[PDB]
Amino acid sequence: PGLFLTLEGLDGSGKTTQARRLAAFLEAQGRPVLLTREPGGGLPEVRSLLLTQELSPEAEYLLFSADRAEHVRKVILPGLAAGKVVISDRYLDSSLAYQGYGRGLPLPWLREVAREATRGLKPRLTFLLDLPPEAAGLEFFRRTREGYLALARAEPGRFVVLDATLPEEEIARAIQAHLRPLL
């Protein structure tokens, strides 16, 4: 039946290091893992389109969504069906935080697009590396950072909020502890 986990945070939060440590830790426990990421896990070329100058926030979200739709269908759901722990470094919450809270797109529209895009697939746990925004324009990063924390307040059983300024090995231990019962 598989287990779906995601990592979230601003760039430079350690989200990527923790994703990779978590995969190693599960693979060293002998259990099959698939490590993936967004953007690009669905449509690797999306990275090009995303860099378009002056891209509207609507277009930006739709590009992330096109990647995400492919990613869920071709990578994530097949991996879960094989009984893998699938870990995504970024998933839907990244859009909600960056394009919703950061760029100001309406959350309900984002969720409706996502409903089909993701086939309703939600992570069992999402580890949010909460990084002060200055350590990542600043106003945008503040909105995005706070957005992530709003998302975590709204779904307090799914989100595990971690202080990204802690040493890496302490963050990893905290992630491992959250995960032990779901083994």
Next chain:
Amino acid sequence: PGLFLTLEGLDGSGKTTQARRLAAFLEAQGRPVLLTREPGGGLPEVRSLLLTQELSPEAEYLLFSADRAEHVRKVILPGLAAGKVVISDRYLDSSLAYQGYGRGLPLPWLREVAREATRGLKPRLTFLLDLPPEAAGLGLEFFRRTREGYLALARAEPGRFVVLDATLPEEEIARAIQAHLRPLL
């Protein structure tokens, strides 16, 4: 105010020819005109990506929507704001017919996605160049679903669609378009 017009139909239906003839007609009347098209009017790389890559219908629709979102904001809306007649060779109805009726995506979700993508911009008239796919065989079934989808769209919005027999001579089609358009000029 500007006036937004679209052309729709199967590939090979004559859209691209009729869009050019309609633009020429409007130029002959001294009316400023902007000709554009989808896919690629917003994000040219979406067009070229989808030439050589086949994706889930959902992903394809979402890429086309990103293109459309950019197209509306950077090209169509600024043309209309300047008072141009903007003509697009393909717009939302393409996705509905091809990704909806053709590939099976649910129409109301497609329209909800489109609502913010397009900022609610609808054409005043849409000219549908209707013909059978053979006039543009298991591969034919997709195109028949798409062709029939377009006809379903048209019969649901008879105030917006004008349906033309695309198998007719190019000039006859053009004069019919002009007659439908004259009450709006």
